[PDB]
Amino acid sequence: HMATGQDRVVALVDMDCFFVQVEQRQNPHLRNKPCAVVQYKSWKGGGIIAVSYEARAFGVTRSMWADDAKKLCPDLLLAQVRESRGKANLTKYREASVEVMEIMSRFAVIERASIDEAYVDLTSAVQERLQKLQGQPISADLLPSTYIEGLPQGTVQKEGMRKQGLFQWLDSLQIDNLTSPDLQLTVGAVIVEEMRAAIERETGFQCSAGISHNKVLAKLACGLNKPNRQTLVSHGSVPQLFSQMPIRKIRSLGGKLGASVIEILGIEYMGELTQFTESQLQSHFGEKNGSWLYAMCRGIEHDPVKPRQLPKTIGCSKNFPGKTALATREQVQWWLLQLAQELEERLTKDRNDNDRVATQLVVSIRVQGDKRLSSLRRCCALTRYDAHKMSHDAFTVIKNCNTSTEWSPPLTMLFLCATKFSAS
DNA sequence: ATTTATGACGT
DNA sequence: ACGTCATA
């Protein structure tokens, strides 16, 4: 009577260093070279936000200043994010992301998780594929970039090991040693190979993927073998996988709650959670978190793949660090106008493309000396896709935040978000 | 001065 | 409504 969280087949697809691949498709000179994408070149060469795998090998990471990355990797090539109205403009990447998600939707139900990753619900697609091929062995040739986590168990080249693990898996499927859920995952992986082939053929982009029974395991699986590969994590693989898996690697446990789990229970690995009762976990972390942890450490999670190919919000913001912090009224107004103009453009395009209208405008700011990402959030009605009205409306709602033709304390961040979409 | 985005939850 | 958390 003990449920095993084996009801669904779920994938998570992550475009490998996505902004970089976009620039590399556009500029063949960047292909197969150590390359990074930077925004804002003046200050320390700019901030790196995406890094090719060739560059990662030199120790280049995101959130590194380009000048610093050049010390680690002198031959590093850089592509700059487009800058419009004095701020980074991510339109090219948003549009490329749409290219990929449109291809994914042909194969299965997708949840847009971010600009560069999507969850995929393959349960239905797997059931249908299982009827078309019935009692036919699944050839290793259908899974040319698939790793089976945990295998092989029992040749000094990675590709050799991959194939040996796959053979062991498939030989035990064909034997009848594995379970029907295992067959379901395997077929799911075949479909993902097919989806990933179609993405590469049609866009030129490569991606890694994880296939498992829920989103957390799929996300975890995806990161196990990168770039351009996919990993199947079976329910059976979970005890060994979790036995040495730091708690912070599991999605949603990378922050404060994860650190609390570690500190309060005196443990380090995900698997160690199984020794606590559900009541115990709830007593420390709350009813929801405790229940979630109890199921998750056993490889079980029920968060559905939401059928949502489009972002629920459309926002833009700009930080104004250090000396650049906004300190006059005219300056604060000029930047609201810049933000509002980008937002109007993206909103109008959204309306035309997606048949919806935003109804709420959220204004957020951060004041100098406040550690919290947001110092304050206020909303007002968004009635007109008009940059001047939007910027003026936003000024109105945050104007009282100023102590006193001058602005103090200085603003270190402005954020306009369009939310609350309705069909149009 | 590691951005500029996102989605979710608690109250 | 508003603040906080988590992710890349």
- The domain that holds A380 is classified in CATH as 3.30.1490.100
Residues in reach of strand C, judged by a CB distance below 7 angstroms, are: A 62, 114, 116-117, 219, 251-258, 360, 372-374, 376-379
Which residues, 6+ apart, have CB-to-CB distance to A312 below 8 Å? A419, A421
CATH (domain of A214) = 3.30.70.270
CATH (domain of A261) = 1.10.150.20
Sign of CA dihedral A172, A176, A177, A179: positive
Report the distance separating Cα A214 and Cα A303, nearest Å: 7
Task: Mark which of A52, A69, A86 sits at the end of a domain.
Answer: A86
Task: Note whether A288 and A397 are same-domain residues.
Answer: no
Identity of residue A250: I
Q: Which protein residue lies nearest to nucleotide B9, measured between its Cα and the C1' atom?
A: A288
Domain carrying residue A415: 305-424
Report the distance separating Cα A203 and Cα A416, nearest Å: 32
Tokens of A48: 């790196």
Report the distance separating Cα A35 and Cα A192, nearest Å: 27
Report the distance separating Cα A393 and Cα A379, nearest Å: 9
Q: Is the peptide bond before A28 cis (omega within 30 degrees of 0)?
A: no
Asked whether the beta carbons of A77 and A34 are under 8 A apart, the reply is yes
Domain count, chain A: 4
Task: For residue A419, give Cα distances in angstroms to A92, A97, A327, A361, A395.
Answer: 22, 20, 28, 6, 18
Q: Which among A331, A338, A352 is positioned nearest to A402, based on CA atoms?
A: A331
Task: Note whether A184 and A237 are same-domain residues.
Answer: yes
Binding site residue list of A for a 2'-deoxyribonucleoside 5'-triphosphate: 62
Q: Which among A424, A2, A14, A8 is positioned nearest to A219, based on CA atoms?
A: A14
Report the distance separating Cα A263 and Cα A297, nearest Å: 17
Task: Note whether A189 and A160 are same-domain residues.
Answer: yes
Task: Note whether A130 and A268 are same-domain residues.
Answer: no
Q: Which protein residue lies nearest to nucleotide B8, measured between its Cα and the C1' atom?
A: A252
The position carrying tokens 């030199």 is: A58
Task: For residue A134, give Cα distances in angstroms to A91, A128, A137, A172.
Answer: 45, 10, 9, 17
**A349: part of which helix (H) or strand (E)?**
helix A329-354
Q: Which among A107, A119, A112, A83 is positioned nearest to A97, based on CA atoms?
A: A112
CA A391 from chain centre, in angstroms, equals 30
Tokens of A293: 């942890």
Task: Mark which of A304, A322, A342 sits at the end of a domain.
Answer: A304
Sign of CA dihedral A58, A60, A61, A62: negative
Burial A275-312, CB ≥16 within 10 A → b, else e: ebeeeebbeebeeebbebbbbbbbbbbeeebeeebeee
Experimental technique of record: X-ray
Nearest nucleotide by C1' position to the A257 CA atom: C5
Asked whether the beta carbons of A273 and A297 are under 8 A apart, the reply is yes
Task: Note whether A242 and A100 are same-domain residues.
Answer: yes
Tokens of A222: 């995806």
Q: How close are the terminal C-alpha atoms of chain A, in Å?
A: 47
Nearest nucleotide by C1' position to the A42 CA atom: B1
In whole angstroms, C7 C1' to A254 CA is 9
Binding site residue list of A for Mn(2+): 14-15, 116-117
In whole angstroms, B4 C1' to A35 CA is 20
In whole angstroms, C8 C1' to A45 CA is 21
In whole angstroms, B11 C1' to A372 CA is 19
Task: Note whether A238 and A252 are same-domain residues.
Answer: no
Task: Note whether A233 and A161 are same-domain residues.
Answer: yes
Task: Note whether A257 and A300 are same-domain residues.
Answer: yes
DSSP code for A346? H
Asked whether the beta carbons of A9 and A123 are under 8 A apart, the reply is yes
In whole angstroms, B9 C1' to A117 CA is 22
* Resolution of this structure in Å: 2.0
Task: Mark which of A61, A86, A111 sits at the end of a domain.
Answer: A86
Chain C bases closer than 7 angstroms to a protein Cβ: 1-8
Sign of CA dihedral A231, A235, A239, A243: positive
Task: Note whether A52 and A136 are same-domain residues.
Answer: no
Task: For residue A188, give Cα distances in angstroms to A161, A194, A195, A224.
Answer: 21, 10, 10, 17
CATH (domain of A75) = 3.40.1170.60
Task: Note whether A422 and A315 are same-domain residues.
Answer: yes
Task: Note whether A11 and A127 are same-domain residues.
Answer: yes
Q: Which among A33, A7, A103, A43 is positioned nearest to A322, based on CA atoms?
A: A43
Q: Which protein residue lies nearest to nucleotide C2, measured between its Cα and the C1' atom?
A: A377
Chain B bases closer than 7 angstroms to a protein Cβ: 1-10
Report the distance separating Cα A211 and Cα A232, nearest Å: 5
DSSP code for A247? G
The position carrying tokens 């890694």 is: A208
DSSP code for A306? -
Tokens of A234: 């079976």
Q: Which among A188, A229, A273 is positioned nearest to A16, based on CA atoms?
A: A229
Tokens of A288: 């929801």
Task: Note whether A12 and A156 are same-domain residues.
Answer: yes
